[PDB]
Amino acid sequence: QDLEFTRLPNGLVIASLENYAPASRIGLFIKAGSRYENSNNLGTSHLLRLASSLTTKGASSFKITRGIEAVGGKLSVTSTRENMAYTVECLRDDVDILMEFLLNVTTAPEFRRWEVAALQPQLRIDKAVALQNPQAHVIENLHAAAYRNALANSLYCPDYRIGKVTPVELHDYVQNHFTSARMALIGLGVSHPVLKQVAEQFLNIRLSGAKAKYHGGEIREQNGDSLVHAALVAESAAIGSAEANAFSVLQHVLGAGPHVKRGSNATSSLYQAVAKGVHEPFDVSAFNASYSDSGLFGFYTISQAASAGDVIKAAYNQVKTIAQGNLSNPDVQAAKNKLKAGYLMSVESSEGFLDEVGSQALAAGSYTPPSTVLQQIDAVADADVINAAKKFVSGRKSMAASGNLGHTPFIDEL
Amino acid sequence: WLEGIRKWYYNAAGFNKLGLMRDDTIHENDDVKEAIRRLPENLYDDRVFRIKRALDLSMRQQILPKEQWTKYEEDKSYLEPYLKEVIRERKEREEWAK
Amino acid sequence: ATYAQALQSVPETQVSQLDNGLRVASEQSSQPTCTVGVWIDAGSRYESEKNNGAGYFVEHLAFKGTKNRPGNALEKEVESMGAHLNAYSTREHTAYYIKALSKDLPKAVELLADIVQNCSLEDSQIEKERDVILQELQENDTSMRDVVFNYLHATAFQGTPLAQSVEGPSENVRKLSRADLTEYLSRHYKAPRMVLAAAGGLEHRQLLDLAQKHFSGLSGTYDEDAVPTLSPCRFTGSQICHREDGLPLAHVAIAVEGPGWAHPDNVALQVANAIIGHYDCTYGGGAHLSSPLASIAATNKLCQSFQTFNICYADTGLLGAHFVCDHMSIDDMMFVLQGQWMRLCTSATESEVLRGKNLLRNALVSHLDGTTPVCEDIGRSLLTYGRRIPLAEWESRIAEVDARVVREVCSKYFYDQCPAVAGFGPIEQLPDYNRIRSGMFWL
Amino acid sequence: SHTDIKVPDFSDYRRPEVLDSTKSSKESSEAR
Amino acid sequence: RPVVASVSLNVPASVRY
């Protein structure tokens, strides 16, 4: 079976792929990430990410949470600095119910006064579980340091903002960003006319965002942890540009993450380069982030306190060698075999598949099948792979780090 | 004719002679405590002060002058939207259980 | 289309055998990716106290040297190929496997012979891992959840090999020899008690030739009295507690004897756990949830997280739960938990059954969204149940389940039984074993 | 560590019906 | 790594990378 793909006058994409699978599935990818939050309404998407299960017009916060659990589905909300998915699942015998629950979330949220009040202090837990995993305030400060206006808005909400969010400060948001011109009622395990029915009957309804003006800057977090974390990046390019596909392969050239469980990561140029001289624990890998307007590229650090400089000055020097022409072709064609795999393996699962069918539909307007991508990986140039790192090295630098920072250098000391 | 009687009963109950309204005097239960929790500040404190003086005057057995009394046309039903909202959820919570 | 039509349209798995004993199976599907592995019958339950921790220690050296691909060469032929490689042990089973593309498959299966059979186990590496192991026992002290189950399995199955850990005590790991590995290796890796499986982009006869090519030389037999069978692992009702008031939270678990793999009422019990379910401090349902154990813990904020389970071993299993809560709220949770089991053994509302039935369906299915979950279920099925089970068979078994069965099952395995209890943290409020059992039976 | 832990043997204290670790419970439990 | 948020009604809230 093949993938339908359409478009209404309202600009509302649809998709459908009746794989004759038992487990239906739906996604509604939307552009409402943290970037469209201005200075006043910070952290609102964090709240709105929890605002599922709340009251609607078509049903209550109670009926939703029980009707779903009866049929046995889900209601998950993946969200990014760009996008805001309202994914679900179910058995295909009972889609017509769960669809009705969904659009009442988006098309008719009441966002009553008091249900919010119970829902705010949940954030102090949500925000807290993440930062047990220390990456997600290292990585946030990059966007906070590097970019300025939109993409610097963390997914998560600042502390002081909690206790103070307004419901009007959602209605204004929803009526300005859940708009049929920039949505995508994706489907799966389900037929196409069914979705074409519902969208025209409920989603047949009617702001913008500024661009990520890169700056170049550094933020520091002396927070007593026993280890160090650090990231060092430079201006990448957005997706769709073939300049992207040079980075995304340059990722695996340089540091990919472990492909072998408990492996020495031999083929990684960077991790191998650290392994000489260093004789203590560490780990390190590439960081590629490619948003619609812009992106970032660099690497991410894990080391002890004293050995931050002695590790970062392996990465920076190494990538210079990758920019000074010192490179081979089989590394690339080996690296492509990784990139050509992770794309396919990511879309192995229906969910990871579903993450890609619509993420294209919002920035782009057409579904690129896997084959057409693998050509774009084959048509890559070893003068783009280089540049690439030339853009990184010559480019302005943004940086952040967390842990003990008594021996961690700035940019300029590199 | 009816409506000439509601306006009269509301004058005989006494609770216009104490600066109060109708929703003020309701028996408090779980169904109602929900609503009084759900009210906004501007109206909630306005509930408090209506009570807080009626008590002090049911202490003395005094009342307000005839001018400051409450008027039937002004007997605002400020609580009914917030209440019937609840019992909707209650019967949704019960019949869904059966 | 519909549901029952769907499971019929699913690929019916295929099976094969080899003269040595190595079962083989697979499942064709249109995924360009694939994944292949070797899901076997070997772990700590077979270890004795002298070779304890072996089944884990091997797992680090297999990918760290062979005879025909020593050093980082094996690690290089995957990365260069662009696949992932993975392994994991257990207390009974074990598994190595690959995630790779379809066309590059004939190279993958070649390696596992070079790994399973031809692991060289060089001593310079044996000493390094012997330090790495003593670095992760330090870590799993912090993986507080896994400490509990290691205590739980250690009590209810006391005296048996099954109370053993996976990585083994720190003592034996500083005493284990090449010969113990060689002797351990040379007994359990045998074709009749092994499996190969894969699915995604392949055909079953792209594969059968390849094990006929590579694995045909495997030792398909043994010295007549060398390959033991199982002991029935008994069950104890006993409590264990690692009182530690200094820590933030207290991880706790309780469970009873499980029936086993083969016993069909597991399809009943998975429903009952689904009726109870799970919660951890993030679900936006709160009070409006359905499982009473959740809405209470959201309402009263008694706990932070808890989950049920159902572990199943050869002729027994483990049924119970794990929960995490502040010290001032343990006793309150346990009353509620016990209240539900007695409620289910006695008064299981039919309307509440169809939930768990409809919950379970969206586990096994959604679990099988990919290839790697499939290839676990295959390689695990061919050593537990025997035949893999087509999912339209589970469904028929479930639709037999009504409220009459549950009241019989839970009576058999919960009511008045001799549970096993575990504790690790500020458990100043944790009630005595007697109080737990007295709270086991309503009235 | 938490693996070096071990449970002692109460076989000086148990019932006779259960001393044989190789056997199972559930056949004398109903009697116990 | 390009971290992404995820919460739910029944899936444990998480941090993809």
Author numbering:
A (entry chain O): 22 to 227, 232 to 439
B (entry chain F): 12 to 109
C (entry chain N): 2 to 444
D (entry chain R): 1 to 32
E (entry chain V): 62 to 78
Quote what the paper states about this structure.
1 is the central component of the mitochondrial electron-transfer chain which is responsible for the electron flow from ubiquinol to cytochrome c.
For the two inhibitor-bound structures, there is clear inhibitor density at the Qi site which does not appear at the Qo site, supporting that these are selective Qi site inhibitors. 1–GSK932121 map is strong for the pyridone head group but is weaker at the tail of the molecule. For SCR0911, His201 is well defined and is in a position consistent with hydrogen-bond formation with the inhibitor, whereas the density for GSK932121 suggests that there is no hydrogen-bond inter­action with His201 and the density is more poorly defined. Comparisons with the crystal structure reveal that the GSK932121 ligand adopts one binding position. As the additional binding pose was not identified using crystallo­graphy, cryo-EM could provide unique insights into alternative modes of binding and occupancy of inhibitors.
